[PDB]
Amino acid sequence: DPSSINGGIVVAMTGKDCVAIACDLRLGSQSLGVSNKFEKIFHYGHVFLGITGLATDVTTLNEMFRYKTNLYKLKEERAIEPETFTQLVSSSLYERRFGPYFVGPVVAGINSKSGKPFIAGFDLIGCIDEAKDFIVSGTASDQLFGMCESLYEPNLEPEDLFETISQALLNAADRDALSGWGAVVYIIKKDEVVKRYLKMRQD
Amino acid sequence: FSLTTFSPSGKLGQIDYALTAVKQGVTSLGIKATNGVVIATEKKSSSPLAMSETLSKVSLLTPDIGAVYSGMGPDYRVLVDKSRKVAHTSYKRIYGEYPPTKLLVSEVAKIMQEATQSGGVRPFGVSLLIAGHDEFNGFSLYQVDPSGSYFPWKATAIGKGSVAAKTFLEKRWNDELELEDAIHIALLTLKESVEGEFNGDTIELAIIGDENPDLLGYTGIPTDKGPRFRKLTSQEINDRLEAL
Amino acid sequence: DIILGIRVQDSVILASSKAVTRGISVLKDSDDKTRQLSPHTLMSFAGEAGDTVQFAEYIQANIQLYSIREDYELSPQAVSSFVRQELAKSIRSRRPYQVNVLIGGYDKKKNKPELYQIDYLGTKVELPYGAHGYSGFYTFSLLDHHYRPDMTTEEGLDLLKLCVQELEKRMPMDFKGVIVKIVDKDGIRQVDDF
Amino acid sequence: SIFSPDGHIFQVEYALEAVKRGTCAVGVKGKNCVVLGCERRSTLKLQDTRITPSKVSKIDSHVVLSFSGLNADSRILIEKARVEAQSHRLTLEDPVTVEYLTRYVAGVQQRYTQSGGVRPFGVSTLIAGFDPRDDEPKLYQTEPSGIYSSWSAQTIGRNSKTVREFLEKNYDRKEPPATVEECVKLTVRSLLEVVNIEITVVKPDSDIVALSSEEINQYVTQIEQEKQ
Amino acid sequence: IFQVEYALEAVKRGTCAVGVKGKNCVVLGCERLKLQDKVSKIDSHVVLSFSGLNADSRILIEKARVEAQSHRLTLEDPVTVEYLTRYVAGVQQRYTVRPFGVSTLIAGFDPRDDEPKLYQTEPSGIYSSWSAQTIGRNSKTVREFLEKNYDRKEPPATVEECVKLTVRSLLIEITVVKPDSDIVALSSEEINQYVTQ
Amino acid sequence: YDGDTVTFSPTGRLFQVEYALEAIKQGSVTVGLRSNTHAVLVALKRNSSYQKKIIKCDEHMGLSLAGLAPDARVLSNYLRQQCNYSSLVFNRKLAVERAGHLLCDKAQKNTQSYGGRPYGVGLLIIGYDKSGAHLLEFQPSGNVTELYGTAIGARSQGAKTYLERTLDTFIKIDGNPDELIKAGVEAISQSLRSLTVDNLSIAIVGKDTPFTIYDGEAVAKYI
Amino acid sequence: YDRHITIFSPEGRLYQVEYAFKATNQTNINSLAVRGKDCTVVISQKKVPDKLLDPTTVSYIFCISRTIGMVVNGPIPDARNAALRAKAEAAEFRYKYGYDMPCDVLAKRMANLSQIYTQRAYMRPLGVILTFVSVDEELGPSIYKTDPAGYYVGYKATATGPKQQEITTNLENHFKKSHINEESWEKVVEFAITHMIDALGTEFSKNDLEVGVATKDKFFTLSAENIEERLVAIAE
Amino acid sequence: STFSPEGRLFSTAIGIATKEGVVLGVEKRATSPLLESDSIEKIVEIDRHIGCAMDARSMIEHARTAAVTHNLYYDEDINVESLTQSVVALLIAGHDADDGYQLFHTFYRYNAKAIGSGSEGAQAELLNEWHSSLTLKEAELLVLKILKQLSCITKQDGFKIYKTAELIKEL
Amino acid sequence: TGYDLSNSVFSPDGRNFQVEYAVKAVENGTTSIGIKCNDGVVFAVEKLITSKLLVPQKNVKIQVVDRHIGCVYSGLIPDGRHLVNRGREEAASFKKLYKTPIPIPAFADRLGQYVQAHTLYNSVRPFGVSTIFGGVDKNGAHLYMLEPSGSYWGYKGAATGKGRQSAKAELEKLVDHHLSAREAVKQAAKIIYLAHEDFELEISWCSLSETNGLHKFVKGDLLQEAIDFAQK
Fold first, then answer.
1. Which residue of B has its CA nearest to D118?
2. Does domain I17-231 have CATH number 3.80.30.20?
3. Do G230 and G222 contact (CB within 8 A), yes or no?
4. Which fold has domain H12-170?
5. Beta bridge partners of B28
6. What is the CATH number of domain E2-196?
7. Tell me, which fold does domain D10-227 have in CATH?
8. Strand, coil or helix: what is C7?
9. Residues I30, I31, I131, I160: which is the catalytic one?
10. At B129, is the secondary structure helix, strand, or coil?
11. Nucleus: present as a keyword of the record (chain B)?
12. CB contact under 8 A, H34 and E133
């Protein structure tokens, strides 16, 4: 399974007027852990994209979406919004559907005009999964699904949203063999983004 | 080999000839208001037995963008087919939303410019008034010329009567125009241009205005808008002429 | 097979095995598994027989073409990006280059050594120390124990000595020693007294 | 697109004429910034000025391109340049230098003067910006023939001769403009020789700003009271 | 062919380039508004100089560079100056909708060899070897000077002599090419010292 | 109207095709004749060596040329290709009539499509097959005529008139190759205004005779 | 060279297209089409100059589809080219979209081809004016006419040919005084023949006319024997 | 690609072909003392036993390719007359086992031929001077004579370019 | 003059001049005729004797297509052969796709579309031949005649070439007075002889009864009877 070679997990949650996206930092060759600095979350303005799956495909899609969003911003003279970027990601995955990329993306951001949270995921069928509560991706998706489904509650404040998402990621990563070696959490607000590194098991 | 080439004076000859073809065309005009855009044109006929209702000189490109032309009708028809095609494949299938007026106008200008630089093809003998709405730029009205050059306008006219129409619009047009007043001014400017019979069947109007959810054709998706482009029917035009 | 790299305070040290084995016998015990891409960039490569040298020479030709075209030395970061693009494109081509590379360079504009590990899939990652294939299974524990970002070239060479001794002790095959090259602000040199 | 008996290419010369009929463009590079300018030509009452695009177009966060000539061809050149600027980053993970983008645009223009079945672009361009992780300004010119050159100050389009004569005797090579204010002053003065201005200042760290109409108004007031 | 002769006219309007090969090296010299602010390496051992339409020189130089690298990629051995000259000449031939309005001096050394090489190409695609040559505007005058100041039985012996002959011929940028991929452009002050002397 | 092969003249003529026919009149005379048993080619070569005017296609067929020789090489190579293809696919000796029709259909293409020019060579093809001895005359226009005897090239009208007068005789020459060759050499003679052992060329094919060419001393006994 | 290929002259005119219009009249036969209450009729002059011709083959009315018929004014070679292309397009539409091509869709597609010839300099316009008639499944009786310039429009009734203006004048007068209100297609055919006679001032035999009738689920052409019955009914 | 109404389509190299070998000679005619005289390859080898004295480079490349291809395909030397067809004014000279020594200039074989601006007089001088008993020595010296007013093909040496000063001194 | 130097150009009159010049080329050809009988068609052509040296019965002019179509043409004979080769390709392709032999009207349309296509582009020349062709198919006998313009119609009798007018004068009398196949052959011979005013008369015919619907040449006794009737 190409997606399972490198491992890693991404989770996005919605708070009250703010969004959080978090991922683990491990890059590995199956059992062997190679790097603890392979961040899987990228931003293209005020919209964040977490990509799990095959690491080469993660890098390729990061480059491709940087290209596409730079051209979009130049042509449109405006930054791409989370919904438009979700559509762009969906269409870009489709353009390679035969011989696909082995990735699961997670879009997270706040629409600048309406100013309200947005998170979306993409499944194997390629269907956009736009969720009001949380999106999980990666090897520990099951662990994350249960953890988020138990911990999440609506309208979390940013300081509570941080704690909820970080606990969900830490406890799911602890139970996934291919995930860990540190975690990073982005708290995305209307005006600012706060990036935090979490203390966690280094085995 | 290229059919459009620079003359010793630096002008492109075939572009000038296509602009002449446009200047011979029937008058069409557009007026931008605070809450809409009206684009109008009059419809001459090949015969009294011809059903003029079968030809629409004002066409929908996206549910928020519409175009009218002046010059050669078949060129406008093929160029509108291409404009719709590109607006769907090159923007909507990629981003999930219809292109804004600026980008669709840029793409139409791209199509027209290619005919001006490719070999074995002559320029399009039409000028387009493209009116549209988009969330970030608002209502906008663009004129596109045979060369592919396009500029935004508050109000403008193209075709046979463009000079008099523009002189009239300069006087009539002002800020704080409501779309109903823009329609009134458009009808007056078009009446002063038409020498033949002037009624809802010899005149064609369309507006970019409020969203029309009743024309959406379905209900139950709250986030879908409904077209902002709307052709005024023959009776809708007639009732306004009866209050001109 | 054995491709090791260590980035120290002032330089990048790359070590690669000397043996070439085709089937039943060792054809050569003095092979150099590195290409100088640039006056201050060096690429070690490992993997299946023909692909390694074919890819290395193709990359070297393209990097030299860029350098001549722009009258400018590509940074190690840009060279590693190009190599990653070439590997990631070929992995979904008719015949992939099954090649793993370490790109060690000295960035003259940032005045910093840089080491990049790229696997045949195109998985680029900038590392303090690197190793491809089973060689990392033995050397990573020693490097985690002893590596310090502030080591001098002498200390990095001693740590490579330790890693190579561990590989010789525990790994089954005879890789016939290593060739060690140092990438520095002064360019590329080879350690013979290793 | 074939040689004259005297060796000139007719279409290239006529494209140069087409450029010469185009609207003005001017640029001056100082110690720390490059300033680009143009007269609005906003004499028409019904033109929608608020959405009318500026003459200066960004190709990348650090590079801007101005032009004089046929607008439709300029847009083709601009889109090609943007695509190339992004493709360079996608291939090697560094932004283009101003030299590289200038060379690409010049090569595009050249290719249409030699390939059959196409006519030259009737556009000359001024390309200004800063190289990645660098602070010295770059300013370049391209014209339909496909050749390009570096400049300390240049003007293209109609009345380019007059304002170039003005610039030659106002710009000093030994003591170039030292601040944004002096660059803008010189650019406005040069354009006022031709008888409303749009000014774009590109500065290191991808700082590109279009000076507001009030700001150019103050510059013009200072220049005018100096004229008295 | 008429187009080729008009390309020759375009060449003859271009700024002059000159080259002289001595015992040990080849020296290429070139003739370079108030507000405005030649030799291109094809490979580490070969340099190309041109006179004519600058724009077409870029097409030719790019193709020559690509071929110089493709030769190494297909055959280990780097291109010889003869081989590169032949390739450039063929490229010029094939384009004759319009020819390249460029003539090129091609200089350098063959791989692991020490005989200096200097070659010329013209828009028709004819190429030839020369002991010293000039191309471009007023090339006839400076070539006539070279024919009498260059000596076939006793050519220049040192870098100083080659540079001196090149500078005198030009009367400025100077490029010196030497074996083992040694290509260097002389500094402005060095050229000034040569000129004053 | 004569600038290209595609333009009809107002009178309905293709001037370029007629110019190609005039190209043949510049070539030296070649003569052909046959009985039922044997078919003969007699050619006046012109010099320097005398260019060979005869071409051998098969043991059962061969041809001679008048006019532009490169066009002769092209058409003859195509004829070989067709004969080899026939023997490859059917083991069938391509009939002389079918070979002539193949030449007819190939050359007509150049007289209708732009970018090409008509073949400026007229060919005489002789062969022997199950139908007996054959002689065909090929022209740049594509027309192919099966003849008892003919002559093409400069001043061939004299040889053609001689063949017309002698037709009653040489048709009766069955199984006597020498008399046919004598009649052919006599016919070519009236086109001169002389023959030497090296100048003259002769070829023959028939019931027993595989296609053979006489040059040099071989033609001496027939002069 | 603006008069030899489809490029603009200084007047903005496309002289080649205008000359292609002249070619349409060179067959010198007139035709007209009228719409009944529920059917469409086309009338065309079958001028036969040679006694050796088989009149069965002389025909400018084409059955494009089960529902659409087409009458052409212009040279028969170009007319047959256009008819073949229209048949191919109607079949391809029925294949791609699963239902019979509407008459107006076919007219638009043909006019777009015509406009392409007017845009690409390599290709000359066809000297044919195409008139499509059908009883559309939605819009009912329909007449659409396409011209060499790529222009098309629907008609209440239309005529084409050298004496187009006279027939159009007669139809205009009738439409002013009055679609054609009849109960069966025979009566509207008789009406169309009557107005053809009156506008052209020339009596017709069964040999002089070709008639096509578009009804629900069928376009068919009348044989000479049927036209004989129609002419007899007019004589009454 | 057109015919005239009259039916026709709209240095100095001297060669002498003897039965002991063919000899070719050319006037280099360098433009200046600077031009590298060695680089004037106006006589070239086509195959081991074929060479010519003169678009030139491309044709010579294709001729060499055809000759080497024939050798590869048949393990035999290409007949000169076949090469002329399968392949500037040309003098093509070579040897084969079918007709031996040959020289060609549509190609016609010649015993001796001259091309260039001097051809119109060199032809008469050849007609007056050439004879069958010429040995390679007289063929060389007569090439030089008619030039005043080198290379050879032999079964033992094949095609080779000349020594030359000596044969001039012997004139 | 000016609009007639290229094949794709309309003149101000709407006439294509190159096609008319191709018609002039047709008018120069020898007379060929076709006659439709109650169950078949008959083809005849005037073959001029250029010289006594032509073998007198082996320069065949009438061409068969498939087995039931016969073709005879006047004008540029090589163009007629080119057209017939295309017709043979079309008939073979139809028989390959559909096991039934190509109907005569279908074949006529294929040839007409091919000939008309040579009047569209400037890079090609119109056919310089008018082709009488016909045969017998599932629905009787058909006789057609192409023109360089691509135009064609069905005919009761057809003639083309230099003597086309004289031949038509007799075809009209045939149609007015009648014509079975046996009599059709003799009348075709008579028409060719009358219109000729040396030559070889070549005749061919395809009739449902007398040839079982296959195209055959007239030879031997029947040919001599036709010739003596013509002489009579």
1. B2
2. no
3. yes
4. Glutamine Phosphoribosylpyrophosphate, subunit 1, domain 1 (3.60.20)
5. B41, B158
6. 3.60.20.10
7. Glutamine Phosphoribosylpyrophosphate, subunit 1, domain 1 (3.60.20)
8. strand
9. I30
10. strand
11. yes
12. yes
